[PDB]
Design an enzyme around this catalytic site. Sequence first.
Site, PDB file in Angstrom:
ATOM      1  N   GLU A   7      -7.534  -2.517  -7.712  1.00 57.37           N
ATOM      2  CA  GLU A   7      -8.101  -1.181  -7.712  1.00 57.37           C
ATOM      3  C   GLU A   7      -8.465  -0.646  -9.110  1.00 57.37           C
ATOM      4  O   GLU A   7      -9.230   0.311  -9.226  1.00 57.37           O
ATOM      5  CB  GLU A   7      -7.141  -0.228  -6.974  1.00 57.37           C
ATOM      6  CG  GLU A   7      -7.024  -0.592  -5.493  1.00 57.37           C
ATOM      7  CD  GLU A   7      -5.904   0.119  -4.750  1.00 57.37           C
ATOM      8  OE1 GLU A   7      -4.843   0.363  -5.364  1.00 57.37           O
ATOM      9  OE2 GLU A   7      -6.075   0.407  -3.544  1.00 57.37           O
ATOM     10  N   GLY A  48      -6.808   2.374   4.993  1.00 59.25           N
ATOM     11  CA  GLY A  48      -7.029   1.981   6.377  1.00 59.25           C
ATOM     12  C   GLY A  48      -7.746   3.070   7.134  1.00 59.25           C
ATOM     13  O   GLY A  48      -7.280   4.196   7.165  1.00 59.25           O
ATOM     14  N   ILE A  94      -0.022   0.065   7.929  1.00 56.36           N
ATOM     15  CA  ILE A  94      -0.258   0.328   9.355  1.00 56.36           C
ATOM     16  C   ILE A  94      -1.222  -0.723   9.900  1.00 56.36           C
ATOM     17  O   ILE A  94      -2.340  -0.872   9.402  1.00 56.36           O
ATOM     18  CB  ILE A  94      -0.813   1.750   9.586  1.00 56.36           C
ATOM     19  CG1 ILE A  94       0.150   2.808   9.001  1.00 56.36           C
ATOM     20  CG2 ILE A  94      -1.044   2.012  11.072  1.00 56.36           C
ATOM     21  CD1 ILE A  94       1.544   2.813   9.572  1.00 56.36           C
ATOM     22  N   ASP A 122      -9.973  -1.801   5.858  1.00 54.96           N
ATOM     23  CA  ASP A 122      -9.548  -2.236   7.186  1.00 54.96           C
ATOM     24  C   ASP A 122      -9.512  -1.034   8.124  1.00 54.96           C
ATOM     25  O   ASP A 122      -9.779   0.097   7.694  1.00 54.96           O
ATOM     26  CB  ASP A 122      -8.182  -2.941   7.129  1.00 54.96           C
ATOM     27  CG  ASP A 122      -7.081  -2.048   6.585  1.00 54.96           C
ATOM     28  OD1 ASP A 122      -6.450  -1.358   7.411  1.00 54.96           O
ATOM     29  OD2 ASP A 122      -6.877  -2.008   5.345  1.00 54.96           O
TER      30      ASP A 122
HETATM   31  C1  LIG Z   1      -0.509  -4.590   0.314  1.00 55.66           C
HETATM   32  S1  LIG Z   1       0.085  -3.086   1.031  1.00 55.66           S
HETATM   33  C2  LIG Z   1      -1.444  -2.192   1.097  1.00 55.66           C
HETATM   34  C3  LIG Z   1      -1.892  -1.543  -0.228  1.00 55.66           C
HETATM   35  C4  LIG Z   1      -3.326  -1.008  -0.194  1.00 55.66           C
HETATM   36  N1  LIG Z   1      -3.076   0.337   0.357  1.00 55.66           N
HETATM   37  C5  LIG Z   1      -4.124   1.165   0.902  1.00 55.66           C
HETATM   38  C6  LIG Z   1      -4.251   0.684   2.329  1.00 55.66           C
HETATM   39  C7  LIG Z   1      -5.326  -0.007   2.874  1.00 55.66           C
HETATM   40  N2  LIG Z   1      -5.156  -0.272   4.189  1.00 55.66           N
HETATM   41  C8  LIG Z   1      -3.979   0.216   4.610  1.00 55.66           C
HETATM   42  C9  LIG Z   1      -3.235   0.253   5.866  1.00 55.66           C
HETATM   43  N3  LIG Z   1      -3.744  -0.299   6.979  1.00 55.66           N
HETATM   44  N4  LIG Z   1      -2.016   0.835   5.861  1.00 55.66           N
HETATM   45  C10 LIG Z   1      -1.496   1.387   4.738  1.00 55.66           C
HETATM   46  N5  LIG Z   1      -2.101   1.400   3.540  1.00 55.66           N
HETATM   47  C11 LIG Z   1      -3.335   0.840   3.464  1.00 55.66           C
HETATM   48  C12 LIG Z   1      -1.719   0.845   0.173  1.00 55.66           C
HETATM   49  C13 LIG Z   1      -1.090  -0.301  -0.587  1.00 55.66           C
HETATM   50  O1  LIG Z   1      -1.190  -0.014  -1.979  1.00 55.66           O
END
Ligand SMILES: CSC[C@H]1CN(Cc2c[nH]c3c(N)ncnc23)C[C@@H]1O
Lengths: 229, 228
Positions: free
Chosen positions: B12, B78, B152, B196
């Site tokens: 990021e 997400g 999530i 996602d």
């Molecule tokens: C490797 S843990 C995911 C990292 C990227 N993030 C943002 C994010 C994208 N999709 C998400 C989802 N489905 N659920 C929660 N968080 C996020 C939070 C974390 O830094």
Amino acid sequence: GMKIAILGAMSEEITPLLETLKDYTKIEHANNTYYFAKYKDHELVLAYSKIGKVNSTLSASVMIEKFGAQVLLFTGVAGAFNPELEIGDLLYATKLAQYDLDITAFGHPLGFVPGNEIFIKTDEKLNNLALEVAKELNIKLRAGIIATGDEFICDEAKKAKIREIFNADACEMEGASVALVCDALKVPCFILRAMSDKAGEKAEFDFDEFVINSAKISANFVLKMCEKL
Amino acid sequence: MKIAILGAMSEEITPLLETLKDYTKIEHANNTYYFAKYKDHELVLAYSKIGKVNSTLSASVMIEKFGAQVLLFTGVAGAFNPELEIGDLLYATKLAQYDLDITAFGHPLGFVPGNEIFIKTDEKLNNLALEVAKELNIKLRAGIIATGDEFICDEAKKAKIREIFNADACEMEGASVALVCDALKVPCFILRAMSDKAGEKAEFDFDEFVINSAKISANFVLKMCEKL
Ligand SMILES: CSC[C@H]1CN(Cc2c[nH]c3c(N)ncnc23)C[C@@H]1O
Ligand SMILES: CSC[C@H]1CN(Cc2c[nH]c3c(N)ncnc23)C[C@@H]1O
């Protein structure tokens, strides 16, 4: 002498110290009040963070990064997991984990994110000081693992799961986050909790009944530790 | 003025470090903080590491130690709102912690005494983002972000959090960073590009799209730095 921070989460956990000190200066900062006092010629900064991981992380960071605290003692109450603990019993954390930090979808263990540890340790010298104070004052003190997360636990199944995964003796909502801040900023940290409830069915009723008194027990103990710093 | 740019993961923030080219670094708070000059602004940059505690600490450090006067958060999220596609940009008007739960005492989910369920971002920074989006012909949506310490990837959980908070997306750092900034009187902007859709197989979409979506968000916040 070393500048000491004393931190709790709720007013009930810190007001007993303010009442004992009597004289202090209040400073509004970080949407909160920070209290500055001299106790038996020790310079103190005190605060209650408000509940949970984010609030307590912010307060620990303020106490160190803004106000220059050199040692941090956390005082408050907790939910007992270990069956040998009773309401009012004191437990200091040897190490702590965040049970609700969950990126297990990517194969990481529960409580783990890259760059950090599953468990954060507290300061050995402070823990040994606490054992000396407990012996001096004839106060029972247990060592254990504390599991931290942003839920008030009042569910036997959740308690059982968290105990099993982390071998945790108690739960609360601030210790692991405070310990992480202190470890990151190279400040010795001590985490003390007095049991207010048993984190099962009706734990909210026990918490409300026993928080005031259990908070006083932990508060008095940390003030006595200040005398040896 | 001094501007903090914060992400959670290396993906990021590294796109900004490559674009800025020249920068110094300081090791502090078990992390690295990066410093550069850009269009008459001193920037401080970091990736916090994942989640609420890590992001809270970094935001606090950037303001209390390194004197940040504004904070722009950049990264991925997400998607919950069905109109969002992977790569789409969303800025948060306000955020909540969906996993902050003392509901046993009668409170709503996300609430603790002394705080509110929702934490707002800065109106003037948000209006600046709209101006940048207009100027660059970039589609930009405003919405609510739900923050918590779980990745999530479950349709039922997604639906629950979306319903309770009317959240358009989820992530693990926004509400915490916004809370710190608000508490320390620092204007905060939270931008996310979707990686996602936070349901079944979201972990696979995340791995596939994080690099590109992170670049989209990063580019945008740097364009904002030119107009500050
Ligand atoms: C490797 S843990 C995911 C990292 C990227 N993030 C943002 C994010 C994208 N999709 C998400 C989802 N489905 N659920 C929660 N968080 C996020 C939070 C974390 O830094
Ligand atoms: C009003 S929320 C509870 C406040 C007191 N805290 C310690 C604690 C005691 N019993 C607990 C339990 N069963 N589950 C989680 N935490 C605790 C955390 C929070 O500040």
